[PDB]
Design an enzyme around this catalytic site. Sequence first.
Site, PDB file in Angstrom:
ATOM      1  N   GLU B  29     -22.384   6.007   0.420  1.00 22.02           N
ATOM      2  CA  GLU B  29     -21.881   4.988   1.341  1.00 22.02           C
ATOM      3  C   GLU B  29     -20.379   5.129   1.695  1.00 22.02           C
ATOM      4  O   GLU B  29     -19.884   4.453   2.596  1.00 22.02           O
ATOM      5  CB  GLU B  29     -22.165   3.615   0.709  1.00 22.02           C
ATOM      6  CG  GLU B  29     -22.300   2.437   1.662  1.00 22.02           C
ATOM      7  CD  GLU B  29     -23.620   2.411   2.407  1.00 22.02           C
ATOM      8  OE1 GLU B  29     -23.794   3.219   3.349  1.00 22.02           O
ATOM      9  OE2 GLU B  29     -24.477   1.572   2.054  1.00 22.02           O
ATOM     10  N   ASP B  33     -10.738   9.967   3.574  1.00 19.18           N
ATOM     11  CA  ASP B  33      -9.458  10.313   4.188  1.00 19.18           C
ATOM     12  C   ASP B  33      -9.244  11.818   4.171  1.00 19.18           C
ATOM     13  O   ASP B  33      -9.572  12.492   3.194  1.00 19.18           O
ATOM     14  CB  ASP B  33      -8.300   9.659   3.428  1.00 19.18           C
ATOM     15  CG  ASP B  33      -7.945   8.272   3.955  1.00 19.18           C
ATOM     16  OD1 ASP B  33      -7.183   8.184   4.953  1.00 19.18           O
ATOM     17  OD2 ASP B  33      -8.405   7.269   3.350  1.00 19.18           O
ATOM     18  N   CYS B  58      -1.030   7.979   8.766  1.00 19.12           N
ATOM     19  CA  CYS B  58      -0.317   7.298   7.701  1.00 19.12           C
ATOM     20  C   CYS B  58       0.306   8.291   6.753  1.00 19.12           C
ATOM     21  O   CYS B  58      -0.262   9.348   6.487  1.00 19.12           O
ATOM     22  CB  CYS B  58      -1.254   6.381   6.918  1.00 19.12           C
ATOM     23  SG  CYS B  58      -1.694   4.857   7.777  1.00 19.12           S
ATOM     24  N   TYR B  75       2.854  -8.053  11.874  1.00 17.44           N
ATOM     25  CA  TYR B  75       3.692  -6.885  12.092  1.00 17.44           C
ATOM     26  C   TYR B  75       3.343  -5.795  11.083  1.00 17.44           C
ATOM     27  O   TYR B  75       3.334  -6.039   9.881  1.00 17.44           O
ATOM     28  CB  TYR B  75       5.183  -7.251  12.005  1.00 17.44           C
ATOM     29  CG  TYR B  75       5.643  -7.739  10.640  1.00 17.44           C
ATOM     30  CD1 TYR B  75       5.530  -9.089  10.275  1.00 17.44           C
ATOM     31  CD2 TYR B  75       6.193  -6.849   9.708  1.00 17.44           C
ATOM     32  CE1 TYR B  75       5.941  -9.534   9.020  1.00 17.44           C
ATOM     33  CE2 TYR B  75       6.600  -7.281   8.449  1.00 17.44           C
ATOM     34  CZ  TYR B  75       6.477  -8.620   8.108  1.00 17.44           C
ATOM     35  OH  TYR B  75       6.891  -9.038   6.862  1.00 17.44           O
ATOM     36  N   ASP B  80       9.636   6.408  13.538  1.00 15.47           N
ATOM     37  CA  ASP B  80       9.730   7.662  14.281  1.00 15.47           C
ATOM     38  C   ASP B  80      11.044   8.337  13.974  1.00 15.47           C
ATOM     39  O   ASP B  80      12.060   7.668  13.781  1.00 15.47           O
ATOM     40  CB  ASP B  80       9.675   7.408  15.787  1.00 15.47           C
ATOM     41  CG  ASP B  80       8.273   7.492  16.355  1.00 15.47           C
ATOM     42  OD1 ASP B  80       7.350   8.009  15.677  1.00 15.47           O
ATOM     43  OD2 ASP B  80       8.099   7.045  17.507  1.00 15.47           O
ATOM     44  N   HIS B 116       5.464   5.782  15.497  1.00 14.88           N
ATOM     45  CA  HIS B 116       4.054   6.173  15.639  1.00 14.88           C
ATOM     46  C   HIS B 116       3.439   6.665  14.319  1.00 14.88           C
ATOM     47  O   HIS B 116       2.402   7.348  14.301  1.00 14.88           O
ATOM     48  CB  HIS B 116       3.928   7.255  16.715  1.00 14.88           C
ATOM     49  CG  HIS B 116       4.335   6.792  18.075  1.00 14.88           C
ATOM     50  ND1 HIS B 116       5.633   6.882  18.536  1.00 14.88           N
ATOM     51  CD2 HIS B 116       3.621   6.219  19.072  1.00 14.88           C
ATOM     52  CE1 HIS B 116       5.701   6.385  19.757  1.00 14.88           C
ATOM     53  NE2 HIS B 116       4.491   5.985  20.111  1.00 14.88           N
ATOM     54  N   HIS B 133      -6.792   5.518  -1.899  1.00 21.18           N
ATOM     55  CA  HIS B 133      -6.591   6.742  -1.133  1.00 21.18           C
ATOM     56  C   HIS B 133      -5.102   7.024  -0.891  1.00 21.18           C
ATOM     57  O   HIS B 133      -4.691   8.181  -0.811  1.00 21.18           O
ATOM     58  CB  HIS B 133      -7.360   6.675   0.188  1.00 21.18           C
ATOM     59  CG  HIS B 133      -8.843   6.844   0.040  1.00 21.18           C
ATOM     60  ND1 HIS B 133      -9.630   7.404   1.026  1.00 21.18           N
ATOM     61  CD2 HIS B 133      -9.682   6.536  -0.978  1.00 21.18           C
ATOM     62  CE1 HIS B 133     -10.889   7.427   0.626  1.00 21.18           C
ATOM     63  NE2 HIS B 133     -10.949   6.907  -0.588  1.00 21.18           N
ATOM     64  N   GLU B 154      -8.492   8.554   8.106  1.00 20.37           N
ATOM     65  CA  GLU B 154      -9.932   8.590   7.836  1.00 20.37           C
ATOM     66  C   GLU B 154     -10.674   9.494   8.827  1.00 20.37           C
ATOM     67  O   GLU B 154     -10.262   9.631   9.978  1.00 20.37           O
ATOM     68  CB  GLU B 154     -10.502   7.173   7.861  1.00 20.37           C
ATOM     69  CG  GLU B 154     -10.138   6.358   6.619  1.00 20.37           C
ATOM     70  CD  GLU B 154      -9.882   4.868   6.884  1.00 20.37           C
ATOM     71  OE1 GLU B 154     -10.041   4.398   8.037  1.00 20.37           O
ATOM     72  OE2 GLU B 154      -9.509   4.159   5.918  1.00 20.37           O
TER      73      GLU B 154
END
Lengths: 325, 320
Positions: B29, B33, B58, B75, B80, B116, B133, B154
Amino acid sequence: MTRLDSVERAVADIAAGKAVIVIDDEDRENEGDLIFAAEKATPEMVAFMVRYTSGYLCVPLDGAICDRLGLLPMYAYTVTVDARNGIGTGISASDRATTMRLLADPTSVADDFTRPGHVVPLRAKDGGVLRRPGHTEAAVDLARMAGLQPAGAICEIVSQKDEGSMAHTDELRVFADEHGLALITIADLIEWRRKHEKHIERVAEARIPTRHGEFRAIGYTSIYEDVEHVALVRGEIAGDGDDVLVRVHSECLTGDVFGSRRCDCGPQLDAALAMVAREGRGVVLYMRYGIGAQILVDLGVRSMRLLTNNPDGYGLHIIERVPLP
Amino acid sequence: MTRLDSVERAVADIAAGKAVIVIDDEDRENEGDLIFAAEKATPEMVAFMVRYTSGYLCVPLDGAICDRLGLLPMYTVTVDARNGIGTGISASDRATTMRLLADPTSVADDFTRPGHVVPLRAKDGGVLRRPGHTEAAVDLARMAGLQPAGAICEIVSQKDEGSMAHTDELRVFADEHGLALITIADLIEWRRKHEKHIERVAEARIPTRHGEFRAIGYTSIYEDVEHVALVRGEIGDDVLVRVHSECLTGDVFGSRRCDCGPQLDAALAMVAREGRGVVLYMRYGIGAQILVDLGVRSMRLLTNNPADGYGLHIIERVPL
Ligand SMILES: [Zn+2]
Ligand SMILES: [Zn+2]
């Protein structure tokens, strides 16, 4: 043996732009720093400091000031600075005074200084002597406690009786007498801050049903430790505050939690709760020196009677020490 | 079942500049990542990730890098690179932001919020303190001998496109692209068998109301609380274990909105009625670590709650 001026003097002298002498504690082998607030640096004062010290002048600064000026960032040679503008060679008491003033002033920025110079900025740990008992921290503390900028100026006092060495405690005592200065210990500064600043705050509040009735359970944290202490409060304390029955019970795991038979701790908390509950008004502090003292004054306790079997400057009145059954 | 690669392979793959795929365990199931080392972020590599993942990139970080850059104190925070990138979304650009978070000499003023890239703060101790993870990513990075900064996202399902890929497909996907698929469970086990992670602080013979227990203070090297372990008899199969959470109100003051007090008591007694058992008082990552150190291989668990990678096997579940 040794006699010290009060912290109350030191703060006031600092506030008045005078200097003080600081040793760590009462031990006779201590060296001493002469200390004034950086924003109170004048030619007269720095010249005085240079006269009787090693001449390696330092400027203890608050982290916030350091970071504004791009200095000693939180993450080998000594970093030195000189005021970029308004000075000559940067070594005379005037120039050094200007530099100190500049470091203290909240408007100044990185390029108001040139590296290198003749002033050693130092980084004081956040929270002062309570977190690190150094002369650096005492200098920023004194400055701040006097309602000034968290910027100080320090240098160690040379000996006059033994030319070769730095002054120790006894000679700093007469030096302080002769020159009308305060002599104080970091020890005395630490515990003054402990007795005159609120370091606690309330985190949680719940009313808990027990075998001994309902208690108002207030949770307290210390700004200088990672732990919730809890005070269990029965009835109304303030309006009044006098004649309050109190137990201060320091946490015992084996005892309180597991019912260990080889310590009376567990039985004693229970008996304290019972007793307080019978009186229909009181405080049992569960603690995990007296930070507990500050909790009591926050609870509006003016005068108390301690529950204890073993026979302060907080405005708490001990009336009678009374046994637990 | 489902073939898994070794941790040993995953780590060497990270070090090489390659990526791995990580799941929790063998369960069909599970989502997965894709992970590589942040410092090893290239245009090629980020582009590969953007291709097959949700594109929500991430960068898990060691708490030390987080503080050092002033991100995520204790938030959605994004970031960047200040210099040397265009608009930020491109693989090249995003690779640069990853590389620069991973560098020890970069500073707060090297970055711009918003950005980003989502920087994530991993818990101290990696997977031994939190089986996430996010923790898996720094751990591999560190184990590879590189900066404790990773990059994850992921893997989207190719077979059922509205969905994220599950275990079956993830293995297929790894086979397709020659990547290593490992589990957090298998990562935990590598680590605990390889690293110092738990200490005994004190021992004593606590004489309770229900007889005598051997009280043992355990501490983690990642936190400074001391948990107590109450042990009866010799421990190591079929042992009755109760893991009890501290409850000050209930354990100590005997609160009655609570029921925790009479629970700890019942446990001690029930363990005592038998010659054998363990009652942990925790002040379950660290829990498990303590049980294996005591020498528990299998256990009957005292809990009122259904549904690892340590040594333990739950033989049964007993109430009250
Ligand atoms: Zn005790
Ligand atoms: Zn509870």
